[PDB]
Design a protein around this ligand. Sequence first.
Ligand SMILES: CC(=O)Nc1cc(Nc2cc(NC3CC3)n3ncc(C#N)c3n2)ccc1N1CC[C@@H](N(C)C)C1
Ligand SMILES: CC(=O)Nc1cc(Nc2cc(NC3CC3)n3ncc(C#N)c3n2)ccc1N1CC[C@@H](N(C)C)C1
Lengths: 123, 123
Amino acid sequence: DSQIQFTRHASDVLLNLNRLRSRDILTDVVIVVSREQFRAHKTVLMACSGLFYSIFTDQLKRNLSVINLDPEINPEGFNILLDFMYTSRLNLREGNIMAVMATAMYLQMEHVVDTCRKFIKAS
Amino acid sequence: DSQIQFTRHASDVLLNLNRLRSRDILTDVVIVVSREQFRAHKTVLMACSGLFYSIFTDQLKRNLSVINLDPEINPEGFNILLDFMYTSRLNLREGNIMAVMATAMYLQMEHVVDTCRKFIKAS
Ligand SMILES: CC(=O)Nc1cc(Nc2cc(NC3CC3)n3ncc(C#N)c3n2)ccc1N1CC[C@@H](N(C)C)C1
Ligand SMILES: CC(=O)Nc1cc(Nc2cc(NC3CC3)n3ncc(C#N)c3n2)ccc1N1CC[C@@H](N(C)C)C1
């Protein structure tokens, strides 16, 4: 708009939110993926994932402190996407592309799915 | 680093966090400023303000659901700064510059204080 724009503010906020996650500060959910557990902030999950948005926006599930994901989801692909949510950085490799793309479709992360489509196309 | 960088991800996350604030979704604190009240997410307050960081990082105050700010703080300057936290946009005018700068010092928002110093200098 007309206001002063701070071009690094959003990235600085996100870095600080990742710092809070690293310290378990104000995390409010544990995501269970196969044999693994990942703590996060529901607000960040909602902001990034259509699946988590759909779950937590509903007053029926808003206050859940544990979410068990589909057992078929592999913790590797989930961890890469959780890190992406909190960093804007996506670790796509040839050895992980299929697991990451299938996990991003499940998480309803359209931008990441489209980027995976670009990765397969360039390889 | 070496990972794919999503240049709009942090701003998109912040926009979605402001959308949750607008809907009172997962807000966990009310900030009382004179006769006014403002709801927010403690994680965003911590990420942006050295005062709120110092308060909520301490296990003694981490779970507080109400924070009463210094009565001398005016809700106008506070609201401009809260909006800045959630948008990267700072509404500085000649009629509000003094109230905004004094509130940013109180909130320990160094980048905003330095920018206010630049505003007074240009006027
Ligand atoms: C299933 C779902 O929830 N889909 C969704 C939500 C929204 N709206 C949203 C979305 C988010 N976050 C999710 C990560 C993106 N957030 N965060 C805070 C608020 C608020 N208030 C909010 N509102 C818009 C579009 C969509 N799509 C439906 C069709 C899809 N494409 C195939 C075209 C896109
Ligand atoms: C009073 C305080 O807390 N000051 C502070 C905190 C930190 N560290 C932080 C700060 C933040 N957010 C606040 C808005 C910036 N966050 N968010 C998450 C984490 C974690 N983990 C975190 N860690 C670093 C520098 C400082 N300053 C001390 C000297 C100051 N200048 C005058 C030079 C700067």
